[PDB]
C-alpha cells in the first residue's frame, strides 16, 4: 500500500510586479546609488516574465514613507497570506474530492512569517477542519519546504498504515515574500550591498492531499503519483551561504553568488543518494541514469535550472514546466514544487510522461531535499 | 511492537534568576510604576523557588542600556541556547547507549528563536549526526511544543516500522525566553500592562531518544515507557487566550487571565478524547478514570496545576513531579514536560511504585491541548 498524491491546486497573489513596477517602487523611495541601479540592471535579467505581490500598486505598502514594522509584517501576511492559503487549500481538497472531516494531517509551512500560534492553527477554522486535527508547522528550510513537508507527510501516513486507519494528509505551503520588500530594499540602499533576492520573488500559496489509501471513498481521486520514497542530504561547510536573517523590521535574505556552481556539485550526488535508499531502485544500474526520470527541480534562480539541467545530463525541454513556473511566478519558496506539480498533472490530462518523476529542492542548511514519485 | 522512549535528560541554563534577581534587574533600569511594583509582587508568589538564565547576574544582557535588537537576541539563542541544546541531546543520547550515527530522525522545537536555518540544522554538525537525517523544526505551538514532538516522532517512527527498517529519533525542545526579558520588561512599563510572563519563564534545554524497536542493538537501553497514542485537541473560541507576538524586539507574550479556568474545562474533555480514540482501553469504564492513570501536566503556571488537579479528581501528590519541576526551573515552555518525564525516571529507579499508565498532558497556543498516553514496558 503506497501514499498517493490525490490533489493538487496553487494560487498565486493577484497583481504582478514587473521590471516597471518595481523600478517605480525603488525609484520612489531612494534616489539611485551604485547599487540601487546594478539591482535594477539585474532585475530585468532574471527571465522571470512575471512575479505577483499581494499589494497592487496603488497598495499603502508601496507607498508609506516608513518601513513596515515587524508587528506590520506578522498582520499583512495574516491579512493577505492565510486568505492565499485558505483558497489554495480548498482547492486541492476540492480537486481531492474527499470532505473536510476527513483531513487526518495538517503539514503547513511558510518562511515568511513567525507567530503563536501559527498560520496553521488560523487555518483549521477557516477550512471547517476536525478538532482533533495533527498539524505540524514546519520552520527554518526555506525553498526546501514543499518537498521537505512531502517528507513529513508522507512518513505520518505510513505511521497510520502500520496502524491500518484511514490517512489524509494536507499539505500547504504559504509564502508572502513581498511582505519584506520595503525592509530589504532600505538595506540595500544603506549598504550598498546588491540584494538579488528583490528580483527573485513572489507571492503564493499552494497546497496538497496525500492519501495512504486506506478506507477509500468513490468521491475521491485515485492516485495521481504514488510517493516511493523521499531523501534528505545536508552538505558539510555550507552554512555561510543561504540565510534568511531575523531582524528588527522582518527578515533579511543573504543570497551567495555561489549558489549555482554549488547546484551542479550536489544535485547529481544528492540523485545518486536517493536512489541507493530507494530498495526497489538500488539495485539496477540503469536507475541511476537522471534522463530515465522525469524531472521536477524547484527554480532558486535561472542559473540554477541551467546548472542542475546541466550535471544531471537533462536538456531544457525535460525541466519545461520548472522553467515555466519559474517565468510566470518567480521563485515561490516552498510552493514552487508543488506549481511544478500542478503543471506537470495539466500537461499528462491533457496528452503527454516519464513512469517516475524526482522532485528536488535546496533549503537552507545548506540541504537538498528529494522525492521519487511514480505514475500509478 | 511499541514505539519507546528509550534516552532522557534535560539541561536548566545555569543561573538562578530568584525573586531578588529579577527585582535588582526591573529597579536597575526603570523607576517605580504601579505596573513595576504590582508584577514585582506577583513575583514573589509564583510558587517558584528557582527558575535559570543564561545570563549570569553580572552579564551585559542585564545591565546594557539599550533594549537589545532581533538579530542581537537571534545570536544569543544561537550563542546560548544550542550549546544548552547540545549538551542536552548529547546527555539523552548517552542515556540511550546507541551512536549518533544511528539516529534517523531530528524532531526540534522552539518558540524563542526564529532562524533560516534552524537551530536543528547546527545541531546535526555539533552531534555529528548522519549527513542524511531527517530533520523536522516545529514552530507555532509554544508550550504543548514538547509533546507535539513527541506525537510526530511517535507518528514518523510508526512508518519505519511500517517499512521494517530500523528508526531512532532524537528529540530536542530548546527555550531561551530571558533573551526577551529586556524587551517584556520595556513594553511593560511603557503600556503599564503588568506581563506575568516576566515572572513564569525560564531557560532550559530538553531531550528524548525514541526508537521503534527494530534492529535493537545490546548497547541500547530497554524501553523506559512505551508511547500508546497521542492526541491533539484545538478548543473553539480560544485565539484571544494566549499569543507570543513578533515586534521590532522579539516576541512578546500576551498571558490571559482566563487561563487556569479554561484549564479545567479542557483537560477532562481532552483526557476522554485521548482515552476513546485508544482502541485498547476505549472499551472499558475505569479506563476513563484518571485517578487510575499517573499523570504529568505541563506547569504553564501554579494556578494551572490546580486547576487540573481538582478537574481531574488528583491529588497534589499526583502530580508531584509537576510541581517540583515548576518549583526548580519554573515554566521553561517546551522543555519542561520532558524534566518532568526525568523525574519520573529518576524516582522509578530509586524505588517509586508508580501506575503502569502515564498520560501526559500540555496547552500550547490555538488553544491546543497536546497529550500522550505511555505504558510501563
Given at each position: 500500500?503506497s ?14 510586479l514587473g ?6 517602487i ?19 535579467k ?23 514594522s515587524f ?12 486568505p ?11 480537486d ?6 476527513e ?17 496553521d ?26 518537498i ?9 501516513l ?32 544603506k ?30 481521486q485515485?492516485?495521481?503519483?504514488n510517493?516511493?520514497?523521499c ?6 561547510g ?24 554549488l ?24 536507475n ?17 535550472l ?25 521563485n ?12 506537470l498533472?495539466?500537461?499528462?490530462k ?5 513512469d ?21
Open positions: 500500500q501514499v498517493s498524491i490525490v490533489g493538487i491546486a496553487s494560487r498565486c497573489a493577484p497583481h504582478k521590471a516597471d513596477e518595481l523600478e517605480a525603488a525609484r520612489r523611495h531612494y534616489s539611485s546609488t551604485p547599487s540601487l541601479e546594478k539591482m535594477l540592471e539585474i532585475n530585468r532574471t527571465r522571470i516574465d512575471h512575479r505577483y505581490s499581494v499589494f497592487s500598486s496603488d497598495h499603502e505598502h508601496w507607498h508609506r514613507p516608513t518601513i513596515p508587528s506590520e509584517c506578522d498582520s499583512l501576511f495574516k491579512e493577505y497570506g492565510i492565499l492559503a485558505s483558497a489554495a487549500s480548498a482547492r486541492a481538497i476540492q481531492w474530492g474527499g470532505v473536510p472531516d483531513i487526518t494531517h495538517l503539514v503547513a509551512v511558510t518562511c515568511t512569517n513567525t507567530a503563536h500560534p501559527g498560520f492553527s488560523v487555518l483549521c477554522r477557516k477550512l471547517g477542519l476536525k478538532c482533533n486535527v495533527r498539524r505540524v508547522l514546519l520552520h527554518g528550510i526555506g525553498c526546501g519546504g514543499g521537505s513537508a512531502m517528507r513529513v507527510a508522507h512518513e505520518l505510513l505511521g497510520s498504515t502500520q496502524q491500518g486507519v484511514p490517512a489524509r494528509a494536507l499539505i500547504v505551503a504559504c509564502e508572502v515574500p513581498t511582505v519584506f520588500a520595503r525592509s530589504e530594499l532600505d538595506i540595500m540602499d549598504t550598498q550591498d546588491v540584494n538579488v533576492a528583490m528580483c527573485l520573488f513572489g507571492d503564493c500559496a499552494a497546497a496538497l492531499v496525500l492519501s495512504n489509501g486506506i478506507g477509500h471513498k468513490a468521491s475521491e485515485r492516485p495521481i503519483w510517493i516511493l520514497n531523501e534528505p542530504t545536508q552538505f558539510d555550507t552554512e555561510d551561504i543561504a540565510h534568511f536573517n531575523v531582524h528588527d523590521k522582518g527578515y533579511h535574505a543573504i543570497i551567495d553568488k555561489r549558489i549555482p556552481q547546484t551542479g556539485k550536489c544535485v547529481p550526488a544528492g540523485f545518486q543518494s536517493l536512489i541507493s535508499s530507494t530498495p526497489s531502485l538500488a539495485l539496477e544500474e540503469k541511476y541514469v537522471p534522463s530515465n526520470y522525469g524531472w521536477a527541480v524547484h527554480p532558486g534562480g535561472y542559473a540554477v541551467v546548472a542542475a539541467q546541466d550535471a544531471l545530463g537533462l536538456t531544457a525541454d525535460d525541466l519545461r514546466a520548472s522553467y515555466d513556473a519559474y517565468r510566470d511566478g518567480g515561490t519558496i516552498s510552493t514552487t514544487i508543488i506549481r511544478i506539480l500542478e503543471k498533472r495539466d500537461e499528462h491533457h496528452g503527454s510522461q516519464k517516475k518523476l524526482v522532485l528536488a529542492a535546496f533549503g537552507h542548511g545548506i540541504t537538498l531535499e528529494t522525492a521519487i514519485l511514480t505514475r500509478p
